[PDB]
Amino acid sequence: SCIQFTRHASDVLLNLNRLRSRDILTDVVIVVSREQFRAHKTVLMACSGLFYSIFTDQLKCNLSVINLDPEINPEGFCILLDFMYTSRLNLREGNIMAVMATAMYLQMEHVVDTCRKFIKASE
Amino acid sequence: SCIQFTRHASDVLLNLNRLRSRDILTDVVIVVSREQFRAHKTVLMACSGLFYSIFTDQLKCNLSVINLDPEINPEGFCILLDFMYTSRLNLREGNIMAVMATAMYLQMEHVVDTCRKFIKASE
């Protein structure tokens, strides 16, 4: 018999992004080819199968620095980190291959699906 | 020129609630008349003007235990904590006064608004 507030989830995510932009309560640095990205472990886990696996590990859950595979492109990661905190994906002809490869590595199934579809349309 | 995934914010919140239910990466205990509630500081801040003020304070941001005012009802808090992580509010004739008072103290404006409206309809 609950009532539901339609905009609640979007409002929560908007506030989580405001905390990220002001570097409030960020608890991890993600290192991608020397580029560094500060974030909230919980948001990373909520969006990515890879971060979910990492931060549920009894040893890795305590790390303040996570280094990604050297093949990962920093721009592709930045676009995906922006998507995690906003639901918006900056998908362009020039970045789609790097975004899809990063989303496959991060295990972000819905992003991989839209990249596959946009690539299929161009062929 | 971004594309947007409609269900992303809801999916994020659903995963944050799964982490709460399994007590994964919870970093604070909220004490309400001896009842204890584990939660994520970032989610509390994203939903409540009171928690936002508390955890942006340079001293309180580091506390692992927060004690609420003794007038706060544990059931009213539990219903609001459930709303924070799900967008669903269990509003009933028997709890509406305690829920509204707790939402006013927590500074959750949209909850206060729906309580005022439901109370006005019954008069």
Binding site: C2, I3, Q4, F5, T6 | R88, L89, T114
Partner: peptide, 4 residues
């Protein structure tokens, strides 16, 4: 607010 809606009835979910």
């Amino acid at each position: 607010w809606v009835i979910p």
